Amino acid sequence: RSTDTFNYATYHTLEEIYDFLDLLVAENPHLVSKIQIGNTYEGRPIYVLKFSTGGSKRPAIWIDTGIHSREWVTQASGVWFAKKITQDYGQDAAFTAILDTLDIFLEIVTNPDGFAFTHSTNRMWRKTRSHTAGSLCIGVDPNRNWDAGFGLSGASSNPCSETYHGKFANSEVEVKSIVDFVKDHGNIKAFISIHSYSQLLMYPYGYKTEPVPDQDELDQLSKAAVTALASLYGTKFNYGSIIKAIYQASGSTIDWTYSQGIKYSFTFELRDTGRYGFLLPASQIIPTAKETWLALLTIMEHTLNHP
Amino acid sequence: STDTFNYATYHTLEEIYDFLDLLVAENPHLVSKIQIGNTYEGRPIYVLKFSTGGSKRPAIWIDTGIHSREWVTQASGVWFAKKITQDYGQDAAFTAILDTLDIFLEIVTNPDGFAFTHSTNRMWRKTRSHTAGSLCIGVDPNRNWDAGFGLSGASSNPCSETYHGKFANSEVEVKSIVDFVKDHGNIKAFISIHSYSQLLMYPYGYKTEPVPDQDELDQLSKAAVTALASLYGTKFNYGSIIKAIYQASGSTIDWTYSQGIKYSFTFELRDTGRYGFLLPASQIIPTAKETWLALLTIMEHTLNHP
Numbered sequence: 234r235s236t237d238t239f240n241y242a243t244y245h246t247l248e249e250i251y252d253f254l255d256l257l258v259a260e261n262p263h264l265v266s267k268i269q270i271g272n273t274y275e276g277r278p279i280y281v282l283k284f285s286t287g288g289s290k291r292p293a294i295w296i297d298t299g300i301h302s303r304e305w306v307t308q309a310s311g312v313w314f315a316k317k318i319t320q321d322y323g324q325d326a327a328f329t330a331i332l333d334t335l336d337i338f339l340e341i342v343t344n345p346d347g348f349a350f351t352h353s354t355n356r357m358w359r360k361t362r363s364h365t366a367g368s369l370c371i372g373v374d375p376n377r378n379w380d381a382g383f384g385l386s387g388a389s390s391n392p393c394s395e396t397y398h399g400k401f402a403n404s405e406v407e408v409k410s411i412v413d414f415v416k417d418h419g420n421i422k423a424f425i426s427i428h429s430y431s432q433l434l435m436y437p438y439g440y441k442t443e444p445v446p447d448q449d450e451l452d453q454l455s456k457a458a459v460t461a462l463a464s465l466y467g468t469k470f471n472y473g474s475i476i477k478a479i480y481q482a483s484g485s486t487i488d489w490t491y492s493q494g495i496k497y498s499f500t501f502e503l504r505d506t507g508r509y510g511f512l513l514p515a516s517q518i519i520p521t522a523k524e525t526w527l528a529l530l531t532i533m534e535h536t537l538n539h540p
Numbered sequence: 541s542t543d544t545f546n547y548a549t550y551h552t553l554e555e556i557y558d559f560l561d562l563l564v565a566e567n568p569h570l571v572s573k574i575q576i577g578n579t580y581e582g583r584p585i586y587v588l589k590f591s592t593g594g595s596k597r598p599a600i601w602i603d604t605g606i607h608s609r610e611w612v613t614q615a616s617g618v619w620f621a622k623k624i625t626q627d628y629g630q631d632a633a634f635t636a637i638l639d640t641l642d643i644f645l646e647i648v649t650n651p652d653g654f655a656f657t658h659s660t661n662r663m664w665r666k667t668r669s670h671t672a673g674s675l676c677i678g679v680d681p682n683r684n685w686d687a688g689f690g691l692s693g694a695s696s697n698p699c700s701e702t703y704h705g706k707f708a709n710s711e712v713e714v715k716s717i718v719d720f721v722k723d724h725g726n727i728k729a730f731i732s733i734h735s736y737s738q739l740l741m742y743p744y745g746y747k748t749e750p751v752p753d754q755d756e757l758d759q760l761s762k763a764a765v766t767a768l769a770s771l772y773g774t775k776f777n778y779g780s781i782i783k784a785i786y787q788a789s790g791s792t793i794d795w796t797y798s799q800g801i802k803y804s805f806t807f808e809l810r811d812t813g814r815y816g817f818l819l820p821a822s823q824i825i826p827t828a829k830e831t832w833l834a835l836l837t838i839m840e841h842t843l844n845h846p
């Protein structure tokens with residue numbers, strides 16, 4: 234095929250997304266590369282796309298989708314983002330300026346075992362697919378497994394729970410693989426984790442009520458990003474710290490990344506507000522991706538202009 | 541007829557409501573249909589009454605489907621209704637239960653939500669009442685009861701899965717049950733059936749304090765899950781709601797227990813997460829059968845302990 238004839242307005246399987254990664258790289262090999270950062274619990278490769286115009290470990294933007302496997306609009310938007318980057322580089326001046334200074338890393342399927350499971354067995358699967366000693370229940374919540382307030386209020390110690398934090402921080406290879414990549418890279422400037430649903434744009438912390446020292450800057454940037462997002466279809470997002478805007482969550486992704494010095498640590502909750510919830514119709518994939526892209530541009534532009 | 545009905549498939553609201561009428565027509569001296577209210581969207585709310593006579597005999601209340609996405613519960617309820625009419629006058633043990641107790645069965649406790657899981661969103665949980673100032677719809681009917689209402693274990697955020705609503709009994713689906721139970725006045729056991737997690741629980745959900753009847757309820761819980769396991773080996777855990785799953789305020793059996801209904805229980809049926817709410821139709825009848833054994837255990841205890 235080609236990525237020009239790929240159907241961005243439908244949901245795809247893991248194999249189809251993985252094939253898309255290869256085709257995108259084959260079509261754009263001086264712009265895009267595919268990095269394997271690990272293997273999942275069940276042995277599947279974990280892939281990140283690196284978009285770059287040169288240099289050695291340039292300051293970088295990290296974007297990940299699908300860490301909760303049932304949130305299908307996120308992986309679908311990720312595929313759309315990947316194609317959009319290759320379309321706009323060298324054509325759109327604003328985005329070209331971003332990529333001329335920063336690299337972008339995009340992990341489209343952050344939880345491949347869960348994603349496979351949502352296609353084969355249980356559409357509403359959330360967690361990883363690891364076995365837990367002393368339990369028959371399967372999986373750890375990858376968004377409770379990070380080393381930031383790990384195991385504190387805002388997660389469950391029950392292995393059968395949707396928010397089970399796991400036996401120890403980074404027990405899940407899908408999480409440890411990202412941690413290892415981020416620490417080895419050492420020059421990640423923004424980290425954006427994309428989830429659905431609720432229509433929120435949030436910054437740290439989720440595990441405690443104390444505001445981050447950078448709250449004023451992150452709140453202003455949030456306001457700018459949701460303004461940009463709403464400009465296209467009028468989609469209304471709220472924003473704030475995780476703990477204020479949704480609820481307390483311990484061991485979650487951007488609390489950790491912020492603790493590593495990544496100032497521009499954000500998470501999106503995409504469409505909708507519950508009518509379809511995780512079952513967002515395919516006809517809403519592209520509108521969701523388009524409006525989200527405007528918000529992403531806002532954050533990346535801010536990152537570019539504040540070295 | 542109810543003899544040609546397919547019990548091993550999931551049905552629509554229309555199909556279940558047709559089933560109610562068929563069961564009544566086929567068993568006119570045993571089964572009747574009572575309308576206890578209308579939903580927010582105007583759908584009738586029906587309870588089946590199984591009775592062999594008397595004037596407001598002591599009764600068992602069983603409800604399924606208060607959380608609409610929990611499809612194995614309504615499917616099990618349909619099977620229970622048929623099972624009652626099959627076994628009465630055939631099975632000595634059950635016949636003895638129904639010769640003293642009435643059984644009330646509410647198969648679709650949240651009809652608007654159930655309709656919505658078929659038309660629009662298979663994972664819909666709440667009622668379908670509108671909330672001013674919010675883009676979100678619906679109240680969690682299992683956080684809307686007047687027992688620890690609005691305390692820790694529920695949300696004040698209208699967009700939340702566990703939104704408790706403006707005040708206790710604000711949801712007509714809940715108040716309809718409250719009104720019926722209070723008017724009846726002789727409900728001896730109240731069993732709320734949910735999925736999933738494979739649990740049999742007793743109060744409280746909203747606080748850690750044990751109920752005064754905890755030893756009796758705990759031992760009955762053990763007996764019931766032992767009975768359930770006897771058929772396929774399905775393993776249920778048991779305990780108070782707050783110890784066995786998590787804290788939940790304004791929930792159903794905390795309220796019923798507070799009204800003096802000692803034998804207040806809730807089931808979480810199959811499975812433990814593999815399919816979760818999406819339990820295959822092939823597991824409907826095994827789920828219903830094993831749960832029936834547990835229900836029989838609770839009903840016989842209720843029968844023998846006024």
Ligand SMILES: CC(=O)N[C@@H](Cc1ccc(O)cc1)C(=O)N[C@@H](C)P(=O)(O)C[C@@H](CCc1ccccc1)C(=O)O
Nearest residue numbers: 301376395396426428429430439475482485486487500
């Ligand atoms: C059925 C349901 O809606 N479940 C929740 C999760 C849940 C379940 C049981 C609980 O007791 C508590 C929470 C969900 O999927 N929510 C999704 C919208 P989310 O799953 O993506 C929300 C997210 C918090 C925000 C966040 C996002 C990224 C990084 C840090 C924080 C979370 O709970 O992980």
Ligand SMILES: CC(=O)N[C@@H](Cc1ccc(O)cc1)C(=O)N[C@@H](C)P(=O)(O)C[C@@H](CCc1ccccc1)C(=O)O
Nearest residue numbers: 395682701702732734735736745781788791792793806
């Ligand atoms: C993802 C998840 O865990 N969802 C929960 C609900 C939920 C969502 C967000 C939260 O923050 C907290 C809870 C669910 O559907 N759970 C079902 C298995 P349940 O929905 O039927 C469990 C039930 C508690 C036990 C109970 C049952 C009957 C009567 C009294 C108590 C509940 O949470 O209402």
Ligand SMILES: [Zn+2]
Nearest residue numbers: 301304428429
């Ligand atoms: Zn998520």
Ligand SMILES: [Zn+2]
Nearest residue numbers: 607610734735
């Ligand atoms: Zn439930």
